[PDB]
Every structure is written in C-alpha cells, then in structure tokens.
Subunit: 160 residues, 3 copies
C-alpha cells in the first residue's frame, strides 16, 4: 500500500576478553568480543529495534527477556527472525534496512558482504534492500579507545 512507516535503532556493547566477536552474524577474529546476554550482536540488535520501532511494537526489552524458555539460549539471528515474524504478524512488510557499525578495530570491510547476506536471509529480503556501513570513531571517546562497538539502523516498512 502507501502506509509507510520508519524506525530507527541504536545499540552499544562493551568489548571484553574471552568471548568471540560476532557482528551481523559474522564471527570476526579478534582478541575481544562483545559483552551481553548471548552473542551480543550489536548490529542485529540495532536492526531489530529499528524494525520493532517502525511497526510500533516497542523494543527488544519489551519482546525478549532473559527468562522466556523459547528464547533462553537464542542467538541474535534467531531473535532477528522472531522480530521479523512479529512485524509481519502486525501486518507490515519490510521494504529496506540500512545500518552503520562504529568500531575503531578490527577492520570490518572484509566481513560486510557476509553480514548483509545474513541479514537479508533472516529478513527474507533481496540483497539490494539491505545495507551495512562501517566507520571508526576517529579515536574519540569510549568507541575510539576500543572499549565498545556501536551500531545504528534505519528501517522502512509498509502496512499492506
């Protein structure tokens, strides 16, 4: 139809020793990884919130608790898939997703295409409706010191 909606998402996680670095579903070689419930995939979380936001469904904290037995061990791609399911349940179709990762290190350019392919598969979208961008923070703040990684996302949906 013509009932378009926009959503915007934000996430950040600390970088800590002793955990794999997983962003956009991609395991990236690195001496640290993101701290959170399961894989702490900051990019998928930001997209997830943008999609909930566009459908006016709240946010991750309203949908996915640590205690739901359906979602206890769930990695962030299972949660992205569930998000997409609830968006459809509310009567919306996803039109496109754009996003930005902010990380001072490691280099993410080798991994961007795989992230895009993972997101497109999880959202049942063609590749040309999914975009992932990657920036440093020019050595400013906790991002520039390598203390965490931020992701931003925007999503367009339509109510059919």
């Amino acid at each position: 139809s013509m009932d378009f909606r926009i959503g915007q998402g934000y996430d950040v996680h600390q970088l800590v020793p002793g955990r794999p670095l997983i962003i956009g579903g991609v395991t990236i070689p690195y001496e640290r990884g993101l701290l959170g419930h399961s894989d702490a995939d900051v990019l998928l979380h930001a997209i997830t919130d943008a999609l909930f936001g566009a459908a006016a469904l709240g946010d991750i904290g309203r949908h996915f608790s640590d205690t739901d037995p359906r979602f206890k061990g769930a990695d962030s791609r299972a949660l992205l898939r569930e998000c997409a399911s609830r968006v459809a349940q509310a009567g919306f179709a996803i039109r496109n997703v754009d996003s930005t990762i902010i990380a001072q290190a490691p280099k993410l350019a080798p991994h961007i295409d795989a992230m895009r392919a993972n997101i497109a598969a999880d959202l049942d979208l063609p590749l040309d409706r999914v975009n992932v961008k990657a920036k440093t923070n020019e050595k400013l703040g906790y991002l520039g010191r390598g203390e965490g990684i931020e992701a931003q996302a925007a999503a367009l949906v339509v109510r059919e």
Copy 2:
C-alpha cells in the same frame, strides 16, 4: 499523497539535582532531573527536531529560542504541539514517529506507555503510529555514568 519526507532528531541534557525529571511529558519520581532552559524534556525535543527536519523547517532552536525568557521552564508538550501546528501549516501530515531514550537510570519501562500516549495526543496520532524505546548505554561513557540522558527520533511525514 506520495510526497513522503523523513526527519531525524537528537538531543541530550545533563542530569542534575534539584530539577524535575520530565521525559515524554511524564514527571518521573527521581532525585535528579534534566537541566535546560525549558523543562528540558529530551525526548520531546528530539521528536520536535525530527518533525521540523522532515518538513525542512529548520530545528527547535530556530523556532523556540533557548535564550528567549518566554520559554524559561516551557512545557515541551506545548512546544511539540506548536511544532506540529507549523508542520501542518507547511502542508504535511505526520505518518509515524519512532524514538529511543538512552539512560542508566531510573528505570523507564513503567513510564513508556504514558510517554507514547502523550506524544500521540500532541501529534493527533493513534497510539499505533507512535513508538518509544528505552535502552541503557551498557555502562559506557557519560551516559553510562548517569551524567545525562540522550534521545533519538525519526519521523515520516507526507505533503498533502
């Protein structure tokens, strides 16, 4: 019509003793509040900027001077309603709003539905076109240290 436009907004205010904590029009019980010339409602200001931006009307500083005495302690819902009136006068209807609050404390989940209802009333929208998300900053930076609260917003409008 199909003459859609998108806008985005950002705001931050310091958290200090001796001020009311007003977010999304809701007076939240808390030992600190947000510092500003107005009532310092960081969520409504971000949404206000997103709406002005979608209509290419500038920003909240252009329309409501931060140094004008008439706005000392101003009700930011009244400012939001006048923003919406000017956006309508420019020829735009609002289609949806999404937003994020980033705060270490207090817990905002008990207040989100009330915020959504306030925004929807001020924009003459049904609740299903308004979304408010609430996150921490995962202990990072001045937001992690509870020194301020940030808000982000996105808005879709259409010129009729």
Copy 3:
C-alpha cells in the same frame, strides 16, 4: 513510483587548532578545524553515507578510497556530487535529506542557509527538500568539550 528506501549516515572528526573548519561546504572562522584526509567535511560525509545506504550501495569507504587517483584531490562536495550520480544510475531519485550537526562551538546557525544551498545544488534538489539542524552537546563528552564534531543524516529515495 512507490519503491521508497531510507538511508542513515554518521560521521565524526577531531577538532584541533591548525586546520580550517569546513562544514556543509562552508568555511567557518574558528580557532580549531576538523582533522581528516582533505577538508574533513563531517556533514557532507554523513549525507553521502545516508545516500549510499538508501541505495544499498555500501558506504564512503567502498566508493572513495584515500589512495584512488580519481578522488585523491577531491573535496567533499565533489564526492557528494559523484555519490548522487551513482545513486541516480542505480535507479533512485532523492526525495529529501535531513541532518544534524553536533558541535559545542562555534555557533552554526548563521551558516545554515549556505550549507542547505550547497547541499541542494550538489544533489540537484529543491531547497525545501534539504534540512540542516545544529545543536550543542550540553558540555557532555568529547563533543561537549570541543574535541570533535559529529554529523547525523537521514535520506529518503525512491526507485524509478
């Protein structure tokens, strides 16, 4: 048509004495300037990234490397024009751009119309489809201490 897409952009640069301050194509008198490859125009970079993102074409790093002889001596307005040409070639018409500059100083309001005019010319857009907003960071963080300047952008396009 009805095939709308949204994009979002982010950029940040350090602010130190010894370089000019160029934002939105406007040189602004100031005791500090932004550090980057050439003019370090944080606003035009964020808009460029939002436009590539809406078209699902990647980001600035994928299109304009520092070493490429075609763009080694290019300022950010030439990059923005080339970005717009590629977005057009991919089949997309730009519908509007909105943006925010976060800088604790200097005051940017006097320069907003000039920035809008530069951006609209570079994108071949009517002025009333381009918006620029400017905020402080309320003295919080590296932005609030004047150590950097950030820009955020949103763009709406339609595939024709």
